[PDB]
Design a protein around this ligand. Structure first.
Ligand SMILES: [K+]
Ligand SMILES: [Zn+2]
Ligand SMILES: [Zn+2]
Lengths: 146, 146
């Protein structure tokens, strides 16, 4: 429902302490409707298709605000490109090298903690220092067949 | 050094969980000592020149194993040509979130194999396709103390 989507985007912006505007409500709805990973230009293309009178600058400033407030997450790929991820729950990524397509993937918590622990021990062995308040990010790159 | 090239190749294979043999150490050294991209026939030409008693079948089985374990990356060109790329990072990274400094770190092979195994299975379940020639990249981000 159109009443529901407005109420849902209003709460997302308010919970994050973002001042509500029509453009921000539309952007929250368009970006957070489905799990996706978009460059700044792809965000502009998406928003521009639904709101052709919104300026590139205003869309870019809202996108930066959304990333600062954690309603989208910044994802950098090994090339310098920055992607805006609409899935904010902790997850990893598989990339199909044939198409460049990105898939969200998760790791079982026990296994993830074993990886995090072994890597912290190897860091300590190699540097003599401990790594504190750690987060783990994994990328699996391969060729999707078919 | 001949000692260093043997040690470097031995670690690459062991990290990937490949059983060490003299032929595999020579192939790992010939393919991975320098950045290059070669077709299957150029790999055979290169290996055959240094190991003329190695059969085409043994060379191609090792090349397929190397691609299966991600120690060589396939470049699958749109023209249908497949190249075997030695420009692979065979370790992981810890990043000191304060300074931005990056440290090389490694994961035990058995544990790396369990992570790839679980992720590949989940990828297959979710997409219906398998991910081939995988390379896992892990980044551990934290505060270095001291
Ligand atoms: K790969
Ligand atoms: Zn994601
Ligand atoms: Zn490195």
């Amino acid at each position: 429902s159109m009443k529901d989507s407005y109420e849902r985007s209003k709460k997302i912006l308010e919970d994050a302490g973002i001042n509500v505007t029509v453009q921000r409500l539309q952007m929250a709805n368009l970006l957070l409707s489905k799990p996706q990973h978009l460059t700044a230009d792809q965000v502009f293309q998406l928003i521009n298709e639904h709101m052709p009178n919104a300026s590139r600058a205003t869309i870019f400033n809202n996108l930066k605000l959304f990333a600062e407030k954690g309603i989208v997450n910044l994802l950098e790929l090994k090339s310098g490109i920055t992607l805006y991820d609409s899935n904010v729950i902790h997850h990893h990524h598989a990339i199909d090298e044939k198409t460049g397509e990105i898939y969200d993937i998760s790791l079982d918590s026990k296994l993830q903690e074993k990886v995090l622990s072994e890597l912290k021990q190897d860091f300590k062995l190699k540097t003599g220092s401990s790594l504190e308040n750690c987060n783990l990010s994994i990328t699996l790159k391969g060729k999707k067949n078919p």
